[PDB]
Write a protein that binds this ligand. Structure first.
Ligand SMILES: Cc1cn([C@@H]2C[C@H](O)[C@@H](CNC(=S)Nc3ccc(Cl)c(C(F)(F)F)c3)O2)c(=O)[nH]c1=O
Length: 197
């Protein structure tokens, strides 16, 4: 029944260095003989993710609710896999999750926050979210849009699982900070928890 692996999500704006730091953490975990799967959302695992790619390339004109639900569906299609890995003691490091879903739809597309949160209710909750904080300053690439998304990400800032990381600092120092925070996580197995608990 118990979750044995740890689940770490990285969030942040498009440029914030999510993928660099997530890659570095994976490498650190592996170097230490911790088994780990590196995942990212959205992905192209099935046809759901293929439609999402066409959206982001602005090749289709999909409505805001339709795309929002495809992003959430792409997370749901991964829950079996993520549950099974964590049950086995394999850690999961994931680049973006439901927090992106809410921040981008509610920030960029002006969808109601609660409506945006609902379809991700019940997803596995991560142990920690590292939010790679880079203030936006001078699809979605316009700084005003980035600022809207930045503002909505603040909806999560007060939560205990949410770890703000100043991602303007040196790559090595960011990595050391993330390793420092990972070493604080409880080592013992625990019950699975779920969004938005
Ligand atoms: C997991 C998730 C992510 N996002 C956004 C949209 C996109 O998936 C990501 C922001 N990064 C982007 S838009 N990268 C990007 C930039 C340019 C281009 Cl062309 C592309 C593409 F190749 F995918 F099209 C991708 O975060 C969402 O809006 N909702 C979600 O649920």
């Amino acid at each position: 029944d118990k979750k044995k692996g740890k689940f770490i999500v990285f969030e942040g704006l498009d440029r914030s260095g999510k993928s660099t730091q997530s890659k570095l953490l994976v490498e650190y975990l592996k170097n230490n003989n911790v088994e780990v799967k590196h995942l990212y959302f959205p992905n192209r695992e099935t046809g759901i993710g293929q439609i999402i790619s066409k959206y982001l390339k602005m090749e289709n004109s999909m409505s805001n609710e339709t795309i929002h639900l495809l992003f959430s569906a792409n997370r749901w299609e991964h829950m079996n896999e993520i549950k099974s890995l964590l049950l086995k003691g394999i850690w999961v490091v994931c680049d973006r999750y439901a927090y992106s879903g809410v921040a981008y739809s509610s920030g960029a597309l002006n969808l109601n926050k609660t409506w945006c949160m609902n379809p991700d209710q019940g997803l596995i909750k991560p142990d920690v979210v590292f939010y790679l904080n880079v203030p936006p300053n001078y699809i979605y690439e316009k700084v005003e849009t980035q600022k809207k998304i930045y503002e909505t990400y603040k909806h999560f800032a007060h939560e205990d699982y949410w770890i703000n990381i100043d991602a303007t600092r040196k790559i090595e120092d960011i990595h050391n900070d993330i390793v420092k925070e990972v070493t604080k996580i409880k080592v013992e197995p625990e019950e699975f928890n779920f969004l938005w608990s």
